[PDB]
Amino acid sequence: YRRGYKFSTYATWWIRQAITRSIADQARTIRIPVHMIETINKLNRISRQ
DNA sequence: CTTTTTTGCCTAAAATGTGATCTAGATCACATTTTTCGCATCTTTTTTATGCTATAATGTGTGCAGTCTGACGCGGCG
Numbered sequence A: 001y002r003r004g005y006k007f008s009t010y011a012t013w014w015i016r017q018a019i020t021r022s023i024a025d026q027a028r029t030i031r032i033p034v035h036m037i038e039t040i041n042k043l044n045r046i047s048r049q
Numbered sequence B: 001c002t003t004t005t006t007t008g009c010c011t012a013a014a015a016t017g018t019g020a021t022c023t024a025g026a027t028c029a030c031a032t033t034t035t036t037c038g039c040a041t042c043t044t045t046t047t048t049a050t051g052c053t054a055t056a057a058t059g060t061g062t063g064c065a066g067t068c069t070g071a072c073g074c075g076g077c078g
Helices: A007-025 A034-048
Strands: none
Touching: A007 A034
């Protein structure tokens, strides 16, 4: 509490992390380590630009 | 009687046979230097498990079915 900010922001970071890599861990019959996942995100975004 | 063809001789001559006596060849079972191979180090080198980011954010549906149907079970349904 001492930071004096709204609590929502905090776990809005934490959860986001948890989700963001739990789907990447699971969610496939093929496991893909995170590094490929990241670079795939790079790819997909930059493709569109 | 003359020719030619043949053989045997002359006359020159190569091929055959003495075996006794060595002499460079090849064997022959077992020790040494080279290949470059295989598993332990390093030793990097890359890759991978794990860890944070402090404005703020508060109840789904999500795209579909086109609804077969006749008999029989079974829970109701009275």
